């Protein structure tokens, strides 16, 4: 029903491919209830400049349903005295009114800014957005579902979130679950240490709070301190295995990284990798062949480090695999490698003294 017209189509303005025409209050309620976020343009004249700017906004966005209405009873239903645009949502304030000049770009900005909840649970449903987001600073509340005062601690987290609307994205994650364990590891946390709060910048470090308390005020202080660069970059290390240097490719962890990497008398080539990463798996036999070629060399060292389980300060890695060259010198220079991930490309780079290949 809400997806077909009767004969009203004979005497009303032409509809749009990109927004659902809403004849009445029932149609509007159904549109809002159909999705987590919905937007309705209230335009008496669907053919006006302002309404068309709205329809252009609707055309450009794929994951939010747009509705449009010219019925005064519907305007009234949503406390509208005149033409306007309203975003609806099944969380927080439940509704946001657009203000300013109705243009495609102003509308797109309006949607983007009010579309996301104050606090977002991390799941495989929410993950794509959180990872493809524009806000490049995140705070994670590791909140176990078994733990008591779940509602309370989440409420403290949401309260704190209000102070950083366009600056820090507030995310909470279920520590108890085994599917979230790699994220735990990546932040160097145990389920025992949780509930806890951690923060990450994606342009590229992690940070922990000074206090273990989870009050709105404590989380707020933590965030405010981070923004003032008052908190030092958080580091983590795996235990160095005794066989770290038994193979042609040397195993680095956080603890021994500086020792071998910035050895002044050694040309060190390091693979920073993720164990679960398909591309790292693909490179692995080639990287071993490179290690084998330079097993008995006088000054070239081939090495790797699991960058999901080790955080050093000299280098930051959010892309896997990443390859970096540490020439033999006192300067402690890092040369980025962007050549072909080939046995031959590595060799030519190594014998160049890491001169070329980007």
XYZ file of C-alpha atoms in Angstrom:
358
model
C 0.000 0.000 0.000
C 2.648 2.531 1.078
C 4.445 1.652 -2.153
C 1.719 2.358 -4.676
C -0.472 5.314 -5.611
C -4.196 5.499 -6.146
C -5.841 7.982 -8.475
C -4.471 10.901 -6.393
C -1.605 10.678 -8.860
C -3.911 12.415 -11.391
C -3.922 15.837 -9.657
C -0.720 16.031 -7.627
C 2.820 17.097 -8.508
C 5.052 14.496 -10.192
C 6.865 12.154 -7.837
C 10.521 11.253 -7.638
C 12.467 8.045 -8.175
C 14.531 8.960 -5.110
C 12.043 9.775 -2.326
C 8.831 8.007 -1.361
C 5.752 10.221 -1.703
C 3.904 10.332 1.619
C 0.133 11.042 1.274
C -0.714 11.008 5.003
C 0.314 10.481 8.643
C 0.170 6.689 8.351
C 2.533 6.665 5.357
C 5.047 8.828 7.247
C 4.984 6.699 10.421
C 5.594 3.629 8.267
C 8.608 5.211 6.565
C 10.249 6.214 9.860
C 9.575 2.773 11.391
C 11.024 0.960 8.359
C 14.609 1.990 9.139
C 17.048 2.990 11.897
C 17.433 6.393 10.232
C 14.871 8.036 7.928
C 14.528 11.529 6.472
C 11.395 13.379 5.354
C 11.252 16.519 3.222
C 8.157 18.597 3.883
C 7.497 20.574 0.692
C 4.140 22.028 -0.346
C 5.467 22.361 -3.883
C 7.454 19.270 -4.835
C 8.629 21.146 -7.951
C 10.186 24.131 -6.118
C 13.945 24.810 -6.023
C 14.212 23.788 -2.363
C 12.335 20.487 -2.844
C 14.517 19.629 -5.849
C 17.681 20.252 -3.807
C 16.240 17.803 -1.286
C 15.534 15.218 -4.010
C 19.169 15.600 -5.160
C 20.294 14.812 -1.612
C 18.051 11.703 -1.710
C 19.507 10.544 -5.024
C 23.095 10.695 -3.696
C 22.499 8.663 -0.506
C 21.835 4.920 -0.867
C 21.508 3.527 2.692
C 18.809 5.836 4.129
C 15.168 5.917 2.944
C 13.866 9.367 1.984
C 10.230 10.403 2.114
C 8.512 13.491 0.750
C 5.193 15.046 1.639
C 3.052 18.009 0.568
C 0.142 17.282 2.939
C -0.462 19.916 5.650
C -1.760 17.364 8.138
C 1.675 15.657 7.905
C 3.481 18.989 8.366
C 1.278 19.478 11.453
C 1.863 15.926 12.717
C 5.585 16.713 13.011
C 5.145 20.273 14.350
C 6.016 21.965 11.079
C 4.595 25.426 10.393
C 6.225 25.503 6.950
C 8.521 23.663 4.508
C 11.427 21.827 6.160
C 13.538 18.670 6.356
C 13.562 16.312 9.344
C 15.883 13.392 10.071
C 14.390 10.655 12.292
C 16.299 7.966 14.211
C 15.573 5.039 16.573
C 18.072 6.320 19.184
C 19.117 9.354 21.268
C 16.992 12.478 20.526
C 14.977 10.454 17.983
C 14.741 13.392 15.590
C 16.796 16.305 14.209
C 15.512 19.373 12.346
C 17.528 20.826 9.469
C 18.258 24.545 9.539
C 19.797 26.828 6.929
C 19.738 27.053 3.147
C 18.270 23.875 1.661
C 20.959 22.715 -0.784
C 22.151 19.230 -1.775
C 25.464 19.813 0.026
C 24.003 21.441 3.163
C 21.550 18.533 3.410
C 24.300 15.914 2.951
C 26.234 17.573 5.762
C 23.123 17.615 7.972
C 22.511 13.887 7.432
C 26.156 12.878 8.001
C 26.290 14.787 11.301
C 23.127 13.355 12.922
C 22.960 9.898 11.326
C 25.148 8.119 13.888
C 24.318 7.287 17.519
C 26.206 8.906 20.375
C 27.470 5.470 21.428
C 27.816 2.691 18.839
C 28.128 -0.977 19.722
C 30.837 -2.750 17.758
C 29.388 -5.691 15.815
C 29.845 -7.042 12.291
C 26.686 -5.034 11.480
C 28.246 -1.727 12.623
C 31.872 -2.480 11.712
C 31.857 -1.286 8.062
C 30.871 2.300 9.043
C 33.228 2.511 12.038
C 36.063 1.489 9.702
C 34.988 3.655 6.759
C 34.286 6.649 8.988
C 35.462 10.244 8.744
C 35.986 10.775 12.483
C 39.497 9.353 12.835
C 39.724 9.298 16.631
C 37.870 6.529 18.469
C 37.381 5.635 22.118
C 36.460 2.027 22.985
C 34.629 1.014 26.124
C 35.377 -2.668 26.593
C 32.136 -3.523 28.357
C 31.585 -7.207 29.220
C 27.943 -8.315 29.064
C 28.340 -10.443 32.217
C 29.493 -7.458 34.303
C 26.952 -5.655 36.502
C 26.044 -1.956 36.213
C 26.187 -2.508 32.435
C 23.407 0.057 31.979
C 25.194 2.405 34.412
C 28.654 2.246 32.823
C 27.207 2.623 29.326
C 25.307 5.672 30.594
C 28.564 7.211 31.894
C 30.152 6.532 28.506
C 27.227 8.154 26.627
C 27.299 11.212 28.951
C 31.031 11.693 28.267
C 30.417 11.249 24.505
C 28.388 14.489 24.445
C 31.526 16.585 24.912
C 33.190 15.293 21.709
C 30.372 15.105 19.108
C 32.467 15.882 16.006
C 35.879 14.954 17.425
C 35.830 11.488 19.020
C 33.651 8.533 18.053
C 32.382 6.628 21.115
C 32.340 2.848 20.598
C 31.560 0.055 23.015
C 32.447 -3.589 22.498
C 31.565 -6.864 24.241
C 34.784 -8.066 25.920
C 33.255 -11.374 27.079
C 32.743 -12.676 23.573
C 35.528 -14.666 21.877
C 34.807 -13.029 18.506
C 36.130 -9.727 19.918
C 39.382 -11.272 21.195
C 41.703 -10.038 18.445
C 40.582 -6.442 19.145
C 41.304 -7.079 22.832
C 44.802 -8.332 21.870
C 45.332 -5.356 19.575
C 44.737 -3.111 22.599
C 46.793 -5.399 24.853
C 43.864 -6.245 27.110
C 42.658 -9.281 29.029
C 39.008 -9.981 29.859
C 40.157 -9.698 33.479
C 41.363 -6.108 32.949
C 38.030 -5.187 31.343
C 35.853 -3.159 31.812
C 38.297 -0.565 30.497
C 38.546 2.315 28.091
C 41.143 2.732 25.327
C 41.607 5.308 22.601
C 43.037 5.183 19.063
C 43.893 7.725 16.393
C 43.729 6.510 12.816
C 45.999 9.331 11.583
C 48.301 6.633 14.571
C 48.558 5.447 18.155
C 46.712 3.858 21.070
C 46.267 5.376 24.564
C 45.155 4.158 27.988
C 43.647 6.200 30.873
C 45.505 7.114 34.070
C 42.595 5.932 36.226
C 40.680 2.663 35.949
C 37.436 4.373 37.035
C 34.635 4.640 34.477
C 32.670 7.714 35.568
C 31.526 10.297 33.016
C 34.065 12.688 34.576
C 36.968 10.202 34.374
C 36.334 9.341 30.708
C 35.877 13.050 29.915
C 39.216 13.899 31.604
C 40.969 11.088 29.719
C 39.693 12.425 26.362
C 40.522 16.053 27.212
C 44.056 15.034 28.239
C 44.590 13.096 25.012
C 43.541 16.109 22.913
C 46.111 18.198 24.808
C 48.806 15.587 24.025
C 49.167 14.988 27.765
C 49.014 11.206 27.455
C 51.982 9.271 26.122
C 51.546 6.757 23.264
C 50.750 3.325 24.619
C 53.086 0.441 23.762
C 52.899 -3.365 23.911
C 55.163 -6.339 23.301
C 55.063 -10.084 22.854
C 57.653 -12.103 24.763
C 60.743 -12.636 22.621
C 61.031 -16.327 21.698
C 64.469 -17.897 22.240
C 64.519 -19.029 18.593
C 63.787 -15.525 17.248
C 67.053 -15.690 15.265
C 67.218 -19.408 14.354
C 65.626 -18.863 10.919
C 66.974 -16.729 8.013
C 64.052 -14.367 8.750
C 64.419 -12.857 12.236
C 61.390 -12.533 14.527
C 60.980 -9.127 16.172
C 58.739 -8.246 19.093
C 58.316 -4.842 20.777
C 61.045 -5.551 23.383
C 63.965 -6.207 20.981
C 62.749 -4.124 18.041
C 65.079 -1.149 18.618
C 68.141 -3.366 19.250
C 68.079 -5.052 15.860
C 66.199 -2.457 13.784
C 68.328 0.565 14.646
C 71.593 -1.370 14.747
C 73.973 1.220 13.276
C 76.129 -1.470 11.704
C 73.253 -3.328 10.053
C 70.959 -2.846 7.043
C 67.613 -4.101 8.414
C 64.517 -4.911 6.307
C 61.391 -5.474 8.386
C 57.989 -6.893 7.482
C 55.226 -5.566 9.701
C 52.366 -8.007 9.301
C 49.043 -9.354 10.511
C 48.853 -13.168 11.015
C 45.206 -13.448 9.855
C 45.821 -11.266 6.767
C 45.554 -13.016 3.385
C 48.062 -10.607 1.788
C 50.583 -11.242 4.547
C 50.070 -14.977 3.957
C 50.664 -14.455 0.233
C 53.916 -12.551 0.860
C 55.236 -15.007 3.485
C 56.890 -17.567 1.145
C 58.498 -14.734 -0.843
C 59.704 -13.088 2.375
C 61.224 -16.425 3.457
C 63.014 -16.704 0.085
C 64.499 -13.241 0.647
C 65.639 -14.294 4.130
C 67.233 -17.372 2.557
C 69.102 -15.313 -0.069
C 70.624 -13.143 2.676
C 71.156 -15.793 5.378
C 74.963 -15.523 5.437
C 75.310 -11.854 4.524
C 77.759 -9.589 6.354
C 75.338 -6.715 7.096
C 71.818 -7.296 5.677
C 69.209 -8.501 8.165
C 65.765 -9.695 7.084
C 63.150 -9.540 9.840
C 59.456 -9.442 10.650
C 57.143 -8.365 13.457
C 53.500 -9.143 14.193
C 52.043 -5.621 14.244
C 48.709 -6.723 15.766
C 50.561 -7.872 18.906
C 53.422 -5.357 19.003
C 53.367 -1.584 19.250
C 56.649 0.268 19.050
C 57.059 4.025 18.952
C 59.547 4.454 16.080
C 57.109 3.150 13.470
C 53.314 3.094 13.136
C 51.493 0.505 11.033
C 47.784 0.361 10.237
C 48.220 -1.359 6.859
C 49.310 -5.004 6.489
C 51.794 -5.892 5.206
C 54.082 -2.872 5.549
C 57.745 -3.079 4.583
C 60.409 -0.745 5.930
C 64.168 -0.433 5.516
C 66.532 0.589 8.306
C 69.899 1.417 6.662
C 73.158 1.005 8.572
C 73.745 4.475 10.072
C 73.666 6.662 13.192
C 70.790 8.745 11.727
C 68.145 6.116 12.569
C 66.451 6.639 9.214
C 63.434 4.674 8.052
C 62.976 4.198 4.305
C 59.482 3.210 3.164
C 59.298 0.393 0.640
C 56.636 0.554 -2.077
C 58.256 -1.489 -4.857
C 57.006 -4.806 -6.223
C 56.459 -7.386 -3.456
C 58.718 -9.699 -5.456
C 61.887 -11.655 -4.689
C 63.543 -9.599 -7.452
C 62.122 -6.231 -6.353
C 63.418 -6.821 -2.815
C 66.907 -7.787 -4.070
C 67.309 -4.735 -6.328
C 66.117 -2.526 -3.473
C 68.533 -4.178 -1.004
C 71.549 -3.925 -3.346
C 70.680 -0.262 -4.026
C 71.253 0.441 -0.334
C 67.498 1.053 -0.403
C 67.857 3.784 -3.039
C 64.831 3.339 -5.330
C 61.490 1.546 -5.666
C 58.342 3.350 -4.540
